[PDB]
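CATEGORY: protein folding

GOAL: derive structure tokens
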Amino acid sequence: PVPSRARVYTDVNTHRPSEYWDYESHVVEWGNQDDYQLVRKLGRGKYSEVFEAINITNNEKVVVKILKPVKKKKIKREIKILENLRGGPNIITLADIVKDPVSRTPALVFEHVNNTDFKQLYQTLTDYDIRFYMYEILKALDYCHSMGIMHRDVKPHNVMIDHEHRKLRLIDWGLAEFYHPGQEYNVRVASRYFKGPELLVDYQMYDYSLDMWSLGCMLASMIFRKEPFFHGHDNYDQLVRIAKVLGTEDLYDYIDKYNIELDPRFNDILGRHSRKRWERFVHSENQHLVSPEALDFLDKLLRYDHQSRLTAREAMEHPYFYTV
């Protein structure tokens, strides 16, 4: 395959000391979980259990994410990344790293965020509300990309919103990675619906632009009230669903530009597809959330070619955000 590199923040990690990006060498200081009393189970994920808790030293609510220790290298990466971005705009704040004395199970303590429901938000969401929260996500992404980090798991479940206080937090940095120009990354990242074309065609030299594809997917489902926007039933099918909107012509131009070898499982499913106009997704139920600005912005995010996508910085300067 043809080599590729990020158009922005290309060398931010190269010009920094080894300690900042070498998570494998980072020394984690595990505090005593006795400072926290668990109140209630909030949810359960693939490799984590999340609890509402009280810090007994200051009577303050916190969120405790007890990790299923399946890979130490991955726990180290998430901790180093959270420490690096600690305090960043709309980045969830890691408050502590603790281990229960008896279990010794790794646990991450975060600031408390009281998330307003996604299905509830969906109906009370205004055109302004979308632009505002999209801009809030861009602040988090422009910041973490400037810090030489790609989230690699941008999706609605990883975006916590406290609608009453108009507060937004980008969470779950468990799939996040440091960007190094020329590095080949694992493509088994992100949630199926939000996976960029680069991941689905096994193009390993990807960058921050991956997060911009995922953000485009979220915007499309929000303005068109179609959740998810690209509804794949598997990873191969996921690429077919994108070709159904973007067309097969631009996909083969993308594979030819980067000399990508297509997996033989794409042989009998890809077919032939025309490019669809963004206007055809507009209906009576969603027209109050759509505008020419929203459609122009979306078109500039959802592109096969990762290099042709808007960066977080360019996206913040789009006319769609003049009102925020």
